[PDB]
Design a protein around this ligand. Structure first.
Ligand code: 8WS
Length: 130
């Protein structure tokens, strides 16, 4: 229905705003674009589902997220990819892991403060009816 279309449109607006706020944070610059395959050849071989904030925006615009739960799975993926690809004790790896965990924590904190639980519940119930 048009009411359900309106619900998912509001979801997309909300998700774009959250994503923009993460993307403009200097700490998360490393997560704003895909890892360049020409610069890092072995990334695509190790990480099976690459994810980054530009790709998240693309997926929002393609109507791929029908719930905030599904969005957070892709935020979790950005984080888990970083931990998987950069597991070593050296400062470079530890920095990206800290930033990845901060990205995840920040996204969850924004959603905790600004997502109405009844809005998410509605989204989930529309999704299940599809
Ligand atoms: C020129 N690039 C490199 O040397 C790469 C850099 C990888 C950047 C890691 N980014 C993320 C998002 O996990 N490092 C190696 C070990 O392949």
């Amino acid at each position: 229905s048009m009411q359900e279309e309106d619900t998912f449109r509001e979801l997309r607006i909300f998700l774009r705003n959250v994503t923009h706020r993460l993307a403009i944070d200097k700490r998360f610059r490393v997560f704003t674009k895909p890892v360049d395959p020409d610069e890092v050849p072995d990334y695509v071989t190790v990480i099976k589902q690459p994810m980054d904030l530009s790709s998240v925006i693309s997926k929002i615009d393609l109507h791929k997220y029908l719930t905030v739960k599904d969005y957070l799975r892709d935020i979790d993926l950005i984080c888990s990819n970083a931990l998987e690809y950069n597991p070593d004790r050296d400062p470079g790896d530890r920095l990206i892991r800290h930033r990845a965990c901060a990205l995840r924590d920040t996204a969850y904190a924004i959603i905790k403060e600004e997502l109405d639980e009844d809005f998410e519940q509605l989204c989930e119930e529309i999704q299940e009816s599809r």
